[model samples]
Every structure is written in C-alpha cells, then in structure tokens.
Target: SKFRLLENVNGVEVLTPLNHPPLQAWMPSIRQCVNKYAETHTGDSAPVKVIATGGQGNQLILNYIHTLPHSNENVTLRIFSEQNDLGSICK
Candidate 1:
C-alpha cells in the first residue's frame, strides 16, 4: 500500500496559514479604529479608509504594526514629513 505523506511546505503554505492567526492578538487595535470611525457622524461614511504618502508611508505602517506589544496598548498611525510644504513632503 502506498500512502502519501506530507512532502514540504512552501512560502504560501507557511505564510498563508499564519496570516489570519495574528488577528487574534491584534484585532483589538483594528477594532478600536473601526469603532472610532463608526462613531463619527460625518457625511462621508465609507466603510474603511487608508491613506499613505509614499514608500516611507508604507514603511511607517509596517513599523507601527511591528512595534505593537500584543497587549491592550493602543495603536494609531500618524505620519509626518520633514518638510512642511506640499511639493517635497518626505524630504
């Protein structure tokens, strides 16, 4: 009898399974954002919103997530630039 055993795990197999698992540890932060957005009585009620400045903006988001302690600590994202002008925001 030939029984096939597990061979190997690839990137998608390894990363995908663990993707949603972090929501257990980090969902509170996301839930807080959702609740704050929901409480707003603004005319524009888009379900969700995301804003980014550039590559630096993306990096900031990653840093925010990575630095979270998985405790009840609040997580909010604030992005800023060196220059206070519109043309060169990230300079």
Candidate 2:
C-alpha cells in the first residue's frame, strides 16, 4: 500500500494518507527511523509508541503500534515534505 507518513513537531503523531488505513505495512520503518534518530541525536530512552490517532485509527495501526520497540514513551517523526489538510496557523 502506498501511503505517506507525517509527524507533529511537538510530538510523535503519524499522519498518513486519507485513503490508506492508519497502519498499512510501513509503520515499523517509520518508527525505526525515528528511534534510530533519537538514539543517535538524543540519548538512551524508551522506544517511541506511534499511536495512529487524529485522522484514521484502525487495527493495522494499533497492531503495528504495539509491535514497536518500546510502545511506552512517545517519539516524533519528522516528514518535512508532507503537509496536512489544514494549513499552517497564522503568525
């Protein structure tokens, strides 16, 4: 399944394509990418739990979410290219 993954700068929020389910089959890669970055960039900590909320929440999402390394603490994934339906806030 072709889907896009976006992140909330403030936290770990997986925003995917509207058509695709919350979790398709690429969540692990996304989460792993984030964790690797966290380890190298930040420091030792629990794995990030990527809960598929906000837009589409489904079993695929939850199932993959549970399979994550930690599934406890939160983490943020930065997909600079992707944009949400809602435009940016006014300055």
Candidate 3:
C-alpha cells in the first residue's frame, strides 16, 4: 500500500488507502505543505482524516473538505512540481 504517515504537523492526521497511489514523485513536497498548512491551524480535535485524491501536478492542488469532525479541510493533499527525488520512497 502507498499509505504513509505524513509527519511534522499538528491537530489532524492525513492518510490514504490506495495502493495504486498518485504523486509517487511529489509526495515529500506535498507532505511538507500539508504540515505547513496544518501548522496554521493547531486544533487537536480529531486524530484522523481519510485523504481522497487522484493524479495531480504542482500549483498546490487541494480537493474537497473532510469527512470527520475537527478534520483539516481538503483531506486530499495532492501536488505535482510539474518533479522527484527518488529513493526507497519512489514506486
């Protein structure tokens, strides 16, 4: 599964259960940005939010609100640098 724990934020959790995931290339940047956004709203109400998304590219693309209480809106945190830094990270 491509489900990974995006660390370094607060208040909410972000996750996805799609084995065939997108942004295999731009995940780190997306993760960073999500945490960045999360930092702006540090309200610890929920511990989880199911991120739903599709293929994407840069420009900070966020889609839809959440399905849980106290969840950071735009559950799906997707982006594309138009790029990648490969490692055990890429698929």
Candidate 4:
C-alpha cells in the first residue's frame, strides 16, 4: 500500500497540485530521494504524500510536510533528513 511521490520539477514528467496546461516536473537528487522512499516502504498501507518546506544548514528551522488528503488528490507521509535518509508512508 506504499506510494511514490514525485517532485514538481523539470526533466521528470509528473503531476502537480496546481492546475496548468498539461506538462511539468521537479528536482533530481531530492526527487530521487522521494522515489527511493517509496520503493523502500512497499508493505505498509498508508499515505505517501508529503511536501518538504524550509531551508537547510540550520537545525532551528523546523520544516514540516502535512500528511493529509486534499480534494480528490492522493497524499501520504514522506520523511527527509539532513543525513539524506528518506522514507514513505503508504495511505
């Protein structure tokens, strides 16, 4: 029940929350992190939709990603760390 979330960046063709024409993408390494998270957690049935916010180089900055569904959108929980350890929670 695990799911993979894609970053809304160029190069990778993935869907976004915003309504555009019909094309878009996101980052590469970070995006790869997101992909790896999903692949790692493919057994648990939970949400995998998460948004990473905040700047790096500062532990005081507590960035948070809400794990909830929006409208008809599919969502889940994703974990990213300074050590680059990524994980996904299936919904």
- What TM-score fits each model? 0.27, 0.28, 0.43, 0.32
Please report how far candidate 1 places residue 48 from its true position, in Å: 5.1
lDDT of 1 at 70: 30
Badly placed stretches (over 4 Å) of model 4 are 1-26, 43-47, 56-91
**Tens-digit lDDT track for model 2 on 1-91?**
3445555422444555456544445455455544444444332342233444332322222212322444444433333213421122100
Q: What C-alpha lDDT does candidate 1 achieve relative to the native structure?
A: 0.26
- Model 1 per-residue lDDT at 59: 23
Find the candidate with the highest TM-score and give its number. 3
What are the per-residue Cα lDDT tens digits for candidate 3 across 24-45?
4545655555555544444543
How many steric overlaps are in each model, in order?
0, 0, 2, 13
For candidate 3, the TM-score is 0.43
lDDT winner between candidates 2 and 3: 3
Which residue pairs collide in model 2, if any?
none
Ranking by TM-score: 3, 4, 2, 1
Error of 3 at 38 (Å): 1.3
lDDT of 4 by residue, 27-46 (tens): 43345544554453343322
Residue ranges of candidate 1 with Cα displaced over 4 Å: 1-21, 41-44, 48-91
Cα error, candidate 4, residue 45 (Å): 3.4
Query: Pick by lDDT: which candidate is best?
Result: 3
